[PDB]
Amino acid sequence: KETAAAKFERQHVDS
Amino acid sequence: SSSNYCNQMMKSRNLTKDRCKPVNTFVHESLADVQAVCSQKNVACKNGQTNCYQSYSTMSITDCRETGSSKYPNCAYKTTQANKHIIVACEGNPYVPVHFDASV
C-alpha cells in the first residue's frame, strides 16, 4: 500500500 | 483529461482519474536531489510546524491549475513553467519529503 513518501513522489516528482 | 502536459500528467499520475484536483506542482529534478532538500534550510511550514525545508537553489517546476471552466470528468488545467525554490515538509527515517508546502 502507498506510504506518504511514495505518494509525494507519484504526485510531485517528474525526473 | 487532454494533451497539454498538466492534463496528461495529472491523469497518468492518478490525480485526476477520479476527481479534478484544483492545483498540483511537478518538480523536474532527480528524485535524490529533491530528497536532498530535507537537510537544507529549515523553515516553519505554513501551519507553523517546523519540519519544513527550503531548497538553496531554484528548481524547474510546472504548476498545474484548473481553469474556471473545468468540471469532472473533463478536468482542464493551465500549465505554468517556472524555476523556483521549493519548500517541502519532511518526516521519517530516512528523512524524506512527504508534503509540498510551496514554491518561492
From Swiss-Prot, chain B:
One of its GO terms (biological process) is defense response to Gram-positive bacterium. Substrate binds at residues 21-25, 46, 65. It catalyses: an [RNA] containing cytidine + H2O = an [RNA]-3'-cytidine-3'-phosphate + a 5'-hydroxy-ribonucleotide-3'-[RNA]; an [RNA] containing uridine + H2O = an [RNA]-3'-uridine-3'-phosphate + a 5'-hydroxy-ribonucleotide-3'-[RNA]. One of its GO terms (molecular function) is lyase activity. Pancreas. It is found in: Secreted. It comes from the Eukaryota. The keyword Nucleotidyltransferase does not apply. The keyword Protein biosynthesis does not apply. The active site is at residue 99. Disulfide bonds join 6-64, 20-75, 38-90, 45-52. It is an enzyme of class 4 (lyase). Its main location: secreted. Its EC number is 4.6.1.18. Glycans are attached at residues 14, 17, 21. Keywords: Disulfide bond, Endonuclease, Glycation, Glycoprotein, Hydrolase, Lyase, Nuclease, Secreted, Signal. GO terms for cellular component: extracellular region. Interacts with and forms tight 1:1 complexes with RNH1. Dimerization of two such complexes may occur. Interaction with RNH1 inhibits this protein. Monomer. Belongs to the pancreatic ribonuclease family. Endonuclease that catalyzes the cleavage of RNA on the 3' side of pyrimidine nucleotides. Acts on single-stranded and double-stranded RNA. This is Ribonuclease pancreatic. The chain holds residues 47 to 150 of 150 of the full protein.
